[PDB]
């Protein structure tokens, strides 16, 4: 049938460098070959649309930027049929996306998999006033040493589900 | 050696029912038997510490509460060596935690696994002014049909990593 061997989508966007008051841009290229996704992520002061570099003539040579945040600032979230990310290659690319030089490879660390459940049950005042409780239970298989988890309690009246009576206070966090 | 066959921890906390201005409580019991974690989650107006029901005599019998939020309000996050959660049993428990009746079982839906990378590389003004870019790349294996993902771009000066130049605007989201 001569089906495509890969499909690639390119996303761009922009923000503002607060220090020099100029636009800063990102480009995210994602390629799907059927076996794996390949991500290529670039931060630059060159507009991807016009290929023109912004006016940063006053930018000092020692000024430096990161393209990633702290270990707790999630940048990538993956669906259930995507496996474990590889190491992250870091490098400097020229105006045409070609590698100028490369730095040390980074390691992906997970913040964990998040879950919720639908068709939530409810407890009425008739039961509540008897001292009854609304209870949910589930099990989670253990496949190795890292059995860490976090749990966020939730309670809300049925006609205003958005207002959490616990408001984020009593979060349960368990290491290692 | 007669090693314990299981270990259990019980977490409690409290919030406020805005409508009736009374404390509302949660209890989370987590049991580890080596093969799986078992979670038991209860929302109630009975104080777990004193075993005393708050004053909700004015609570109308038709008043109802949920113990969970929307499909996007993450309540449980699991570490890398924890597998896929089972179905969630829903039921009403009495003052002593015994089942009074049960409702329909709920289904856990994942919000995905979150990731970040450390040892982030940096680009200096000398390179930026050449029209160069800071680039990271990685691959992700595909094991099924759901290859959805989200990506949040990030850029910050190296002496103030906390201020994201993209501020959350250009988030990349891909279905199904
Ligand atoms: Na964690
Ligand atoms: Na998703």
Residue numbers in the entry:
A (entry chain A), B (entry chain A): 204 to 379
Provide the publication's sentences verbatim:
However, during purification of the heterologously produced BR187–385, higher oligomer states were formed in the final size exclusion chromatography (SEC) step. Interestingly, these isolated oligomer populations were stable in solution but not in steady-state equilibrium with the monomer, as demonstrated using AUC and SEC. Since stable oligomer formation of PsrP could be relevant for pneumococcal biofilm formation, crystallization trials were set up for the isolated BR187–385 dimer in order to obtain a molecular understanding for stable dimer formation. Therefore, a shorter construct was designed by deleting the seven C-terminal residues in BR187–385 that were not built in the previously determined crystal structure due to missing electron density. Well-diffracting crystals were obtained of the isolated irreversibly associated BR187–378 dimer. Analysis of the crystal structure solved by molecular replacement revealed that the residue stretches L202-G315 (region I) and Y316-S377 (region II) are reciprocally exchanged between two separate chains. This reciprocal exchange of entire protein segments is termed 3D-domain swapping and has been first described for diphtheria toxin. A common feature of domain-swapped oligomers is the requirement to pass a high-energy barrier between the non-swapped and swapped states. Thus, it should be noted that the irreversibly associated dimers were only obtained following heterologous production of the isolated BR protein constructs, and that, at this stage, we remain uncertain about their formation in vivo. Moreover, intermolecular β-sheets are also observed between symmetry-related domain-swapped dimers with similar interfaces and hydrogen bond patterns.
